[PDB]
Amino acid sequence: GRLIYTAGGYFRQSLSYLEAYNPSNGSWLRLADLQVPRSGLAGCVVGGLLYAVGGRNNSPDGNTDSSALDCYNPMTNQWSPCASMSVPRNRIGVGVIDGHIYAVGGSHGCIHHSSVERYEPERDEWHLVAPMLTRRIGVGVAVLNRLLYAVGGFDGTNRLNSAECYYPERNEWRMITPMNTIRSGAGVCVLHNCIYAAGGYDGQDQLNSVERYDVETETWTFVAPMRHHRSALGITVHQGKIYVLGGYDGHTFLDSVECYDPDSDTWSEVTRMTSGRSGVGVAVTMEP
Numbered sequence: 001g002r003l004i005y006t007a008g009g010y011f012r013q014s015l016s017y018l019e020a021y022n023p024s025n026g027s028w029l030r031l032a033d034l035q036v037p038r039s040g041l042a043g044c045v046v047g048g049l050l051y052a053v054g055g056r057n058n059s060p061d062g063n064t065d066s067s068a069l070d071c072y073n074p075m076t077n078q079w080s081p082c083a084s085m086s087v088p089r090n091r092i093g094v095g096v097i098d099g100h101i102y103a104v105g106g107s108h109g110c111i112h113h114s115s116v117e118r119y120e121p122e123r124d125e126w127h128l129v130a131p132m133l134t135r136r137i138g139v140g141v142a143v144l145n146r147l148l149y150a151v152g153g154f155d156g157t158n159r160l161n162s163a164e165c166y167y168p169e170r171n172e173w174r175m176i177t178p179m180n181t182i183r184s185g186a187g188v189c190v191l192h193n194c195i196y197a198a199g200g201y202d203g204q205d206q207l208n209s210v211e212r213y214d215v216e217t218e219t220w221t222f223v224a225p226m227r228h229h230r231s232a233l234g235i236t237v238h239q240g241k242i243y244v245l246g247g248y249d250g251h252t253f254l255d256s257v258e259c260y261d262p263d264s265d266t267w268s269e270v271t272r273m274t275s276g277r278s279g280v281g282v283a284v285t286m287e288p
């Protein structure tokens, strides 16, 4: 079976939790802590291994942006450090193409990155690629048809409705149709032929709205809203369904986990995290 892994996050300070949720039986397992607490990180999976990428340790002892890449092996329940990125990237987005990890955007102090870099597990090496056309932190990233999409975020002055696409064989970014909603710190994922953008912050309010981009029609369409307004949510896909994990609603650090069924176009509550938190990294792989 396959589990939904949530790594890190934020409640009062950055967290080192790694916990796994099993959709088949409702259960949560607490597994080995991150070596370094971090919020604003991304999770991804390559070759059955879980990776935690970037973030920031917000701690009473000081605040440190992370250039770290760390690898969790479910077989051993151990974290191993990998090569660090060129730069710290808090509020990062990541996507996997052809067994390589793309690290996109994020912040280092007041630096809002447009830069993008690619990790090759077989060589344990990062290399920079073409930068985005826009500086983006709190950027949503998704992969569809071996193309990489960067969606919304914050450019240092404004939250963004814009999005762009990276064409690996041209090493080139191009704008796509902008979303119907400004979204920073949203959850972005892919399901079937569509990129979904769920929640986020629009500059004024946390959002419950959810819209999806069909690459064949180049248009964004709203689907049913989530039950909870949320920014800095985790999102993943498990068995053809979107799961959104935690985030912040303007009032509470949510423990709510909601699940979207695209056939009924409905959201439902499925479980709650063991504790409320925002800014987690999420991905899916085999059980330990």
Ligand SMILES: CN(C)C(=O)c1cccc(-c2cccc(-n3ncc(C(=O)O)c3C3CC3)c2)c1
Binding pocket: 010, 039, 040, 091, 092, 137, 138, 139, 153, 154, 159, 184, 185, 200, 201, 231, 232, 247, 248, 278, 279
């Ligand atoms: C209430 N606290 C501070 C938290 O919940 C929190 C804590 C740590 C980390 C994050 C986080 C994670 C990912 C992205 C972003 N992000 N990136 C950009 C913007 C923006 O406001 O535009 C944001 C905010 C809306 C979520 C933040 C949020």
Ligand SMILES: [Cl-]
Binding pocket: 039, 040, 056, 058, 090
């Ligand atoms: Cl932060």
